[PDB]
Amino acid sequence: VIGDFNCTNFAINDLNTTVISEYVVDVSYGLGTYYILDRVYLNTTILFTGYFPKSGANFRDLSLKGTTYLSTLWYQKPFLSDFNNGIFSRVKNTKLYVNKTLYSEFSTIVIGSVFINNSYTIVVQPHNGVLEITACQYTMCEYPHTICKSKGSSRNESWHFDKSEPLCLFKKNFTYNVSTDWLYFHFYQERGTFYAYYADSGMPTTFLFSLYLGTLLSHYYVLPLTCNAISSNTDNETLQYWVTPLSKRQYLLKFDNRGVITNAVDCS
Numbered sequence: 001v002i003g004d005f006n007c008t009n010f011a012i013n014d015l016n017t018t019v020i021s022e023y024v025v026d027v028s029y030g031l032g033t034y035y036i037l038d039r040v041y042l043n044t045t046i047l048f049t050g051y052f053p054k055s056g057a058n059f060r061d062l063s064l065k066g067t068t069y070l071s072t073l074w075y076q077k078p079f080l081s082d083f084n085n086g087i088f089s090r091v092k093n094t095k096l097y098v099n100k101t102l103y104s105e106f107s108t109i110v111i112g113s114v115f116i117n118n119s120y121t122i123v124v125q126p127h128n129g130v131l132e133i134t135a136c137q138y139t140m141c142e143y144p145h146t147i148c149k150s151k152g153s154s155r156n157e158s159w160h161f162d163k164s165e166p167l168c169l170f171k172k173n174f175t176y177n178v179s180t181d182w183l184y185f186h187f188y189q190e191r192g193t194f195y196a197y198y199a200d201s202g203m204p205t206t207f208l209f210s211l212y213l214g215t216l217l218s219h220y221y222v223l224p225l226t227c228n229a230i231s232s233n234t235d236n237e238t239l240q241y242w243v244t245p246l247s248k249r250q251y252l253l254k255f256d257n258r259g260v261i262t263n264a265v266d267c268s
């Protein structure tokens with residue numbers, strides 16, 4: 001389980017519906033890199049040491065789409081994952097339509113340790129072009145999940161159950177371009193401080209925020225999303241949430257004559 005609060009018992013079973021899909025990391029076009037601090041470099045190559053993917057390691061697609069039932073197996077290893085230094089995410093923006101109006105959906109991610117309400121859990125969740133980010137003492141459910149707020153779902157939303165507002169270290173919103181096909185994120189920790197970088201356009205990410213926690217983060221998990229759409233019998237749309245572990249590595253980076261990172265090489 002995630003957390004330990006019994007939020008609901010509606011439509012739960014133990015069915016093995018899944019295999020973790022895999023894809024190979026290739027940083028040759030700047031995927032997995034980030035812009036360095038407040039610096040700018042022009043028409044040049046730099047050797048830089050940072051939190052980067054291993055080139056030629058795998059991405060895992062951790063996204064899960066449900067309709068009514070939730071499998072208990074979705075809330076265990078290999079999905080519940082060790083955080084270590086951090087993770088890089090490549091996220092498909094699942095652009096849906098209702099009455100020819102566009103809506104953006106993708107999987108919420110949570111990062112934490114015990115997920116009990118005596119500890120801080122980070123949550124990153126989209127709301128159709130608003131990205132909501134929080135770090136609070138949430139009472140996480142045993143079986144957390146989200147919903148398609150656009151197309152609807154056969155079940156109500158529940159990933160935490162706090163009746164009063166929980167204590168929070170952080171709460172902010174960031175906009176993202178709902179028209180783009182891919183969002184990239186780095187999440188990592190150093191000396192008890194969490195760091196987040198993202199991009200919605202291009203591949204190299206840029207700094208969103210950092211947050212002192214003091215405690216080591218140990219686990220992350222990508223929430224199942226429940227929807228009456230997003231399947232081969234209604235629209236052939238799909239969720240994807242690819243992740244791969246970060247580590248301290250040396251990269252060659254190439255910056256063009258307008259300061260964009262166009263290419264990179266992992267030096268091992």
Ligand SMILES: *[C@@H]1O[C@H](CO)[C@@H](O[C@@H]2O[C@H](CO)[C@@H](O[C@@H]3O[C@H](CO[C@H]4O[C@H](CO)[C@@H](O)[C@H](O)[C@@H]4O)[C@@H](O)[C@H](O[C@H]4O[C@H](CO)[C@@H](O)[C@H](O)[C@@H]4O)[C@@H]3O)[C@H](O)[C@H]2NC(C)=O)[C@H](O)[C@H]1NC(C)=O
Nearest residue numbers: 003004005006007115116117118138139140161162163164
């Ligand atoms: C921070 O997070 C913790 C969990 O990590 C929360 O603690 C849990 O809080 C809930 C809600 O108060 C507790 O659930 C209630 O426990 C009562 C006692 O359980 C014993 O008795 C029942 C029989 O009544 C046995 O089956 C059980 O094995 C235990 O021996 C129950 O009496 C309550 O049941 C009643 O309410 C539910 C509500 O849905 C009804 O469905 C039932 O029919 C019944 O009317 C209820 O189950 C839970 O025990 C707490 N867990 C722990 C480990 O402490 C904190 O509440 C949370 N803090 C904040 C501020 O939110």
Ligand SMILES: CC(=O)N[C@H]1[C@H]([C@H](O)[C@H](O)COC(C)=O)O[C@@](O[C@H](CO)[C@@H](O)[C@@H]2O[C@@](O)(C(=O)O)C[C@H](O)[C@H]2NC(C)=O)(C(=O)O)C[C@@H]1O
Nearest residue numbers: 015017018064065066067069070071228229230231233234
């Ligand atoms: C994580 C995962 O495996 N995700 C897949 C999902 C699950 O395996 C399934 O939910 C598990 O179920 C458990 C745990 O019991 O199956 C999906 O495909 C279904 C068929 O497998 C889909 O076509 C549904 O078929 C129905 O016959 C039915 O009820 O399953 C009628 C329903 O209206 C229709 N859903 C719609 C309209 O989206 C789905 O979506 O749910 C595609 C998802 O990628």
Ligand SMILES: *[C@@H]1O[C@H](CO)[C@@H](O[C@@H]2O[C@H](CO)[C@@H](O)[C@H](O)[C@H]2NC(C)=O)[C@H](O)[C@H]1NC(C)=O
Nearest residue numbers: 126127128130131132133134149171172173174
């Ligand atoms: C951040 O974005 C969220 C999601 O849009 C905002 O939350 C909504 O706020 C309105 C007005 O208070 C409520 O009616 C809704 O119920 C809220 N939830 C949702 C899911 O829409 C939030 O107000 C924004 N700002 C901050 C500081 O969090």
Ligand SMILES: *[C@@H]1O[C@H](CO)[C@@H](O)[C@H](O)[C@H]1NC(C)=O
Nearest residue numbers: 004005006007008009010142
């Ligand atoms: C969860 O809560 C419901 C309602 O109280 C109860 O029927 C069910 O047996 C509970 N399950 C567990 C594992 O506590």
Ligand SMILES: *[C@@H]1O[C@H](CO)[C@@H](O)[C@H](O)[C@H]1NC(C)=O
Nearest residue numbers: 014015016017018019020073
């Ligand atoms: C689920 O099915 C996959 C693919 O067949 C298999 O690799 C895996 O061991 C199964 N897991 C469980 C829990 O049965």
Ligand SMILES: *[C@@H]1O[C@H](CO)[C@@H](O)[C@H](O)[C@H]1NC(C)=O
Nearest residue numbers: 042043044045255256257258
């Ligand atoms: C970029 O660098 C190359 C190699 O030194 C040079 O040939 C080219 O003229 C430079 N262009 C600009 C606009 O700096």
Ligand SMILES: *[C@@H]1O[C@H](CO)[C@@H](O)[C@H](O)[C@H]1NC(C)=O
Nearest residue numbers: 008010011154155156157158
């Ligand atoms: C969803 O919420 C509504 C309103 O409280 C309730 O009538 C319905 O039974 C709930 N369904 C589930 C599966 O939680």
Ligand SMILES: *[C@@H]1O[C@H](CO)[C@@H](O)[C@H](O)[C@H]1NC(C)=O
Nearest residue numbers: 177178179180181200201202
């Ligand atoms: C949003 O994304 C689309 C597709 O990449 C792009 O054409 C458009 O110019 C972007 N708009 C803004 C305001 O970023």
Ligand SMILES: *[C@@H]1O[C@H](CO)[C@@H](O)[C@H](O)[C@H]1NC(C)=O
Nearest residue numbers: 230231232233234235236237
């Ligand atoms: C999904 O794509 C397949 C292959 O083209 C097709 O057979 C199927 O009818 C499509 N379903 C929908 C809802 O478009």
